[PDB]
Amino acid sequence: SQLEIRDLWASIDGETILKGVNLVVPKGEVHALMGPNGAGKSTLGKILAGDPEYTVERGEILLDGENILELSPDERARKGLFLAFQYPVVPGVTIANFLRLALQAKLGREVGVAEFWTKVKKALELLDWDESYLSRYLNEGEKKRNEILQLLVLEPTYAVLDETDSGLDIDALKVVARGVNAMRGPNFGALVITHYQRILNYIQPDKVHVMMDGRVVATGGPELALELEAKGYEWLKEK
C-alpha cells in the first residue's frame, strides 16, 4: 500500500551522503521531494533506481511490503517501480517500435499489434496527443516526452521522477505534469524530485518532503513548497 524509504544511510566515493532518510509515499498519492542541490534528493532517486555506484550502509526500501534494495533495476521494475528504457544516439527507430520494445521487456513476452496499439491509443487519449507522434524517430523536452509515453504504457505502480534537470523549462515541466496527472489514481503513487517549486503548480502534491544534509528535515502540504519558493532554502534551514 506504499513505497517506503526506511532509515536509509548511503555513501559514494567513500563519503556518506544519505543520513537516515525516512520517506513514505502511499499508493494513490503524489508527493514532492525538494531540497538544495547536493543535499541528497537526487542521490536518493539514483539509489531507488538501483545505481550500483552507491553503497547502502543501513536501511530498507519497501515496495508494497517487500525490500527491493537487493533487487536489480530490472527486478524492481518487475515489482512495479518505473524504469524507463534507454536507447543510444541510432537512426531509423520509430517511437512506436521503441515503445513496443520497452513494453515487451517490462512484460517478459511478445506483445502483439492489437495489445500494443490498444494500450498506445489509450495513453494518447489520456495525454491528448496525436498518433502521428509515434512515427517520429528516436533522437530526431523530447527525451521527456518519450519517457512520459513509457510511463503511461508500462503502467508502473510507483514512479520516481527527478525533474531537477529540467530547471524552469516550462514546456518540459508541463509534459511531465500531464503524464503524472494522467496516471493519478488508487493504483499509482509518485515522488517528484525537484529543486524549484515551479512544477508543483502543474502537479499538485499531497505532501512535500524537504531534504537537507542527507535527511528529511521538514514535511508539509503544498504550502510548504510555496513558502520555500518565496523565501528560499536558507530560510527553512533556520526555521
**Least distance in Å: CB of 79 to Cl ion?**
24
Amino acid (one-letter) located at 208: V
Nearer to Cl ion, 42 or 150 (CB): 42
Please indicate if the annotation marks 40 as binding a ligand.
yes
Using DSSP's 3-state secondary structure scheme, residue 217 falls into strand
User: Closest CB to Cl ion among 40 and 59?
Assistant: 40
Contacts with Cl ion by CB under 5 A: the residue count is: 3
Buried b (16+ CB within 10 A) or exposed e, 41-53: bbbbbbbbbbeee
* 3-state secondary structure (DSSP) of residue 70: coil
Where in 71-90 is the site for Cl ion (CB under 5 A)? none
Nearest distance from residue 38's CB to Cl ion, in Å? 5
Q: What part of residues 113-142 is at the interface with Cl ion (CB under 5 A)? A: none
The neighbour count for residue 132, using CB atoms within 10 Å, is 8
φ, ψ (nearest 5 deg) of residue 3:
-105, 120
Q: Which residue is nearest to Cl ion, using beta carbons?
A: 42
Please report which helix (H) or strand (E) contains residue 32, including its range: strand 30-34
Tell me how far apart the alpha carbons of residues 146 and 84 are, in angstroms, rounded to a whole number: 9
> Is the CB of 42 or the CB of 146 nearer to Cl ion?
42
Q: For residues 36 and 222, which CB has a smaller minimum distance to Cl ion in the complex?
A: 36
Question: What 3-state DSSP class applies to 59?
Answer: strand
**Residue 38 assigned as binding residue:** yes
Q: What are the helix (H) ranges across 184-239?
A: 222-231, 233-238
SS3 100: helix
Position 197 contacts Cl ion (CB under 5 A): no
One symbol per residue from 20 to 59: x for binding Cl ion (CB under 5 A), - otherwise; what is it? --------------------x-xx----------------
Nearer to Cl ion, 42 or 197 (CB): 42
d(CA 55, CA 128): 42
> Please, what is the minimum distance in Å from the beta carbon of residue 41 to Cl ion?
5
Distance in Å, CB of 23 to Cl ion, minimum: 14
In the complex with Cl ion, the residue whose CB is nearer, 40 or 189, is 40
| Residue 69, φ and ψ in degrees, nearest 5 | -55, -30
The answer to whether 103 and 119 have CB atoms below 8 angstroms apart is yes
Annotated binding-site ranges for Mg(2+): 41-42
Annotated binding-site ranges for ADP: 38, 40-43
**Interface residues toward Cl ion, by CB under 5 A:** 40, 42-43
Annotated binding-site ranges: 38, 40-43
